C-alpha cells in the first residue's frame, strides 16, 4: 500500500457538447476578450462552478420549505454567496441564486478587481502585474489571477511591499540602467 494513493482529485471543467456552435464561439470569445482570459478552459471552469452551484440551489428548492436539510444547506449556500460577493443582502433567497451568471463570478476575479480599482491601465496589464507579484490581497502576495476575492478582502488589495510599485528596491532593468548612466 502506498499512502499517496488515498489522496483524491477531481476535474474542474468539461468540453462543450457541440464543438463548433458559431453563436457559442462568438459569446465565449467576447467574454474571454472582455475579461482577459488566456483560453476557453478558464471560462469553462467558471461555467462548471456556476452550474454546480445552480444545481445545488435547484435541488434545495425542490425540497419542502420546512425541511431541515433545505434550511441548513440553503443558509450555507447563501452565506457562501454573500461572503464571495455574488449576492447582496437584499438577495436573501435561494431563488436569486438561480439568477447568477458567469459574469458575476468573473467579476470577482483578482484580475478584474485589480483592473477595476484602478491599479492597472487594462485587464491584461492587471494580469501581468498579478503574475509578476506586484499585488497583495492582505499581507499575503497573490500571483493567481483566478483568485476569488471575498467582500471583506476586497478593500485590502494593495501593491506588494517588496515590489517597485509598492515599496523600494526598483527592478533589475532600472538598476542596470542606473548603473550604466552612472558613468
Amino acid at each position: 500500500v502506498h499512502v499517496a494513493f488515498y489522496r483524491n482529485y477531481g476535474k474542474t471543467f468539461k468540453k462543450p457538447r457541440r464543438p463548433y456552435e458559431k453563436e457559442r464561439l462568438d459569446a465565449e470569445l467576447k467574454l474571454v476578450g472582455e475579461y482577459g482570459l488566456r483560453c476557453k478552459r478558464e471560462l469553462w471552469r467558471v461555467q462548471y462552478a456556476l452550474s454546480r452551484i445552480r444545481n445545488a440551489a435547484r435541488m434545495l428548492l425542490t425540497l419542502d420549505e420546512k425541511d431541515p436539510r433545505r434550511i441548513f444547506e440553503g443558509e450555507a449556500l447563501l452565506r457562501r454567496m454573500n461572503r464571495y460577493g455574488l449576492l447582496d443582502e437584499s438577495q436573501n433567497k435561494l431563488d436569486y441564486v438561480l439568477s447568477l451568471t458567469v459574469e458575476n463570478f468573473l467579476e470577482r476575479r483578482l484580475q478584474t478587481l485589480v483592473f477595476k480599482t484602478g491599479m492597472a491601465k487594462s485587464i491584461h496589464h492587471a494580469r501581468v502585474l498579478i503574475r509578476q507579484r506586484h499585488i497583495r490581497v492582505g499581507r499575503q502576495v497573490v500571483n493567481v489571477p483566478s483568485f476569488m476575492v471575498r467582500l471583506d478582502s476586497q478593500k485590502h488589495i494593495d501593491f506588494s511591499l517588496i515590489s517597485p510599485f509598492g515599496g523600494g528596491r526598483p527592478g533589475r532593468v532600472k538598476r542596470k540602467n542606473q548603473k550604466a548612466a552612472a558613468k
Binding site: 462568438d26 467576447k30 482577459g36 482570459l37 488566456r38 491584461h124
Partner: protein, 52 residues
C-alpha cells in the same frame, strides 16, 4: 490499353510537386495576447474571415 495504375507509381505527385521555401514571418503572440488579438479583430475592429 494504358498505364492507368501500378505499384511503381507511388510518390508520383509528391515527387513532381516543385519545392517552395517557407516564408519567414514574425511569430504571433501566445495565449492571452493571442485571444486579445482575436477579440480585437472580430469584435472591436469589425464576409468570412478568410474571404477574398
Amino acid at each position: 490499353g494504358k498505364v492507368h495504375g501500378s505499384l511503381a507509381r507511388a510518390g508520383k505527385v509528391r515527387g513532381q510537386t516543385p519545392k517552395v521555401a517557407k516564408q519567414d514571418k514574425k511569430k504571433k503572440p501566445r495565449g492571452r495576447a493571442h485571444k486579445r488579438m482575436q477579440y480585437n479583430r472580430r469584435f472591436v475592429t469589425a464576409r468570412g474571415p478568410n474571404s477574398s
